[PDB]
Design a protein around this ligand. Sequence first.
Ligand SMILES: Cc1cc2nc([C@@H](CNC(=O)c3c(Cl)cc(-n4cnnc4)cc3Cl)c3ccccc3)[nH]c2cc1C
Ligand code: NA
Lengths: 234, 55
Amino acid sequence: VVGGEDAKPGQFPWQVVLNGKVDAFCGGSIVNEKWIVTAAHCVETGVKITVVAGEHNIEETEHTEQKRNVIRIIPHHNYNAAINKYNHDIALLELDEPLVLNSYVTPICIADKEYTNIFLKFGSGYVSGWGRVFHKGASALVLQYLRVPLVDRATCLRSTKFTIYNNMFCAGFHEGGRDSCQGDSGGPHVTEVEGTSFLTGIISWGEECAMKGKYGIYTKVSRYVNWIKEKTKL
Amino acid sequence: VTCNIKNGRCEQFCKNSADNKVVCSCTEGYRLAENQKSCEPAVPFPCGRVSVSQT
Ligand SMILES: Cc1cc2nc([C@@H](CNC(=O)c3c(Cl)cc(-n4cnnc4)cc3Cl)c3ccccc3)[nH]c2cc1C
Ligand code: NA
């Protein structure tokens, strides 16, 4: 996250970090005690992934961290990386042992399709992650967060040479300086509804992070709500 | 009183019902409150809630 602020501990208790050969290569969100939702491009190879819930400062031990191994990866049935690595960019991770829910490890709410789309239409969401804090710069140590406004589709299409399908949305600022970045992919875009946060997007991709005229591209969660509920039911 | 106007005054979800009334509802782990609009926690750690002191 570029142009964000340090989260306080437990401020985004649904946030998880994915660790592999590199740490904090992607983010994720807690669906329930056994399931994480992330981007499909984060987990497209069959590599071992470590999920850490209750994380705050990725280079300090703080007591609240719960580490789990991923036993099953479910990319969306319409995901096809050979065709497009960033279309239907959503996956579910099944954990080896359930998380212990507490004030630092809490799921994100997921509304039905209609309400997930109404919540996105409020026009302002929070994104969070341990991604880069400058374009081509270092990753964050402390979890970062940022409020991002929804960007209209036409402005969004005019900003990039790549295709933006209707299952994606753009968010960010016309002047640049504030955006998600590499390492934040797979993390949550959430909308606060009278003090309860609902998952409205998955952080997906972009080009020059926070460059004036560019925006962050996100997967619309509303399209996948039924599939998430079906696959993650305990 | 309809779900198009201020979400029927429902905190989370609204459904239009008979005689120009609405029925509010909540996501998993919440209970519809006695005031018929608000959503109260029904489990120890309900989704989407910040419970750690932010002070
Ligand atoms: C907001 C945000 C911005 C990001 N920027 C980067 C990358 C630079 N972007 C690319 O390599 C790229 C390109 Cl050029 C084309 C497509 N693409 C093609 N067809 N559809 C989509 C997709 C990508 Cl990710 C980077 C790499 C290294 C350092 C910094 C940034 N990752 C990001 C993730 C986020 C969440
Ligand atoms: Na830590």
